[PDB]
């Protein structure tokens, strides 16, 4: 509907700082590459 890309790495539209773990689960955790809201599937 918009170019905000609603995701864990995005509040209303802006994307979390590059290097901010959006998802912190026991199985794994995603980070933010300051690019898109879609939390990549490449843990660290």
From Swiss-Prot:
Tissue spec. comment:
Expressed by the venom gland.
Disulfide pairs? 4-13, 9-32, 10-37, 22-39
- Highest taxon in the source lineage: Eukaryota
What does its PTM field state? Two conformers are found, they may differ by their disulfide bond connectivities. Conformer 2 is 33 times less active than conformer 1. Conformer 2 may represent a non-native protein. The C-terminal dipeptide may be post-translationally removed, as seen in disintegrins that possess a KTS integrin-binding motif.
Q: Where is this motif: Cell attachment site?
A: 24-26
Annotated localization? Secreted
Additional information: Negative results: does not show inhibitory activity toward alpha-IIb/beta-3 (ITGA2B/ITGB3), alpha-V/beta-3 (ITGAV/ITGB3), alpha-2/beta-1 (ITGA2/ITGB1), alpha-5/beta-1 (ITGA5/ITGB1), alpha-4/beta-1 (ITGA4/ITGB1), alpha-6/beta-1 (ITGA6/ITGB1), and alpha-9/beta-1 (ITGA9/ITGB1).
Q: How does it assemble?
A: Monomer.
Q: Which family does it belong to?
A: Belongs to the disintegrin family. Short disintegrin subfamily.
* Physiological role: Recombinant protein inhibits the adhesion of alpha-1/beta-1-K562 (ITGA1/ITGB1) cells to collagen IV with an IC(50) of 80 nM.
Q: Could you identify this protein by its name?
A: Disintegrin jerdostatin
Organism for this UniProt entry: Protobothrops jerdonii
**First and last residues shown, out of full length:** 68 to 108 of 110
């Amino acid at each position: 509907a918009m170019d905000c890309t609603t995701g864990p790495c995005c509040r209303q539209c802006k994307l979390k700082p590059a290097g901010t773990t959006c998802w912190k689960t026991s199985v794994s955790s995603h980070y933010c590459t300051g690019r898109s809201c879609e939390c990549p599937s490449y843990p660290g």
